[PDB]
Structure 1
Amino acid sequence: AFCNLRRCELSCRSLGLLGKCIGEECECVPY
């Protein structure tokens, strides 16, 4: 299902990192 990138940036911000939509599922990434 089409992934929200804007939400995943601010959700991964809690960990300290950026969220990417990979295969339309979110991943907080080390970059």
Structure 2
Amino acid sequence: AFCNLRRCELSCRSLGLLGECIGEECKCVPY
């Protein structure tokens, strides 16, 4: 499976941030 970027985003949105995928995993970004 791919990284769930379309849900990673909604998760970082709860912190007021953007979401981003690196390799197979999720992080948040200041963008």
Q: TM-score range by the shorter chain?
A: 0.7 to 0.9
Give 1:24 shift. Answer: 1.4
Taking the aligned partners of 1:24 and 1:16, their CA distance within structure 2 comes to 23
Taking the aligned partners of 2:29 and 2:23, their CA distance within structure 1 comes to 14
Structure 1 residue 5 corresponds to structure 2 residue 9: no
Could you say what the CA RMSD is over the residues aligned between the two structures, in angstroms?
Answer: 1.1
Give 1:23 shift. Answer: 1.5
Gap runs ≥5 in structure 1:
none
Gap runs ≥5 in structure 2:
none
**Which consecutive aligned stretches of 4+ in structure 1 deviate over 6 angstroms post-superposition?**
none
Give 1:2 shift. Answer: 2.1
- Report the count of equivalent residues: 31
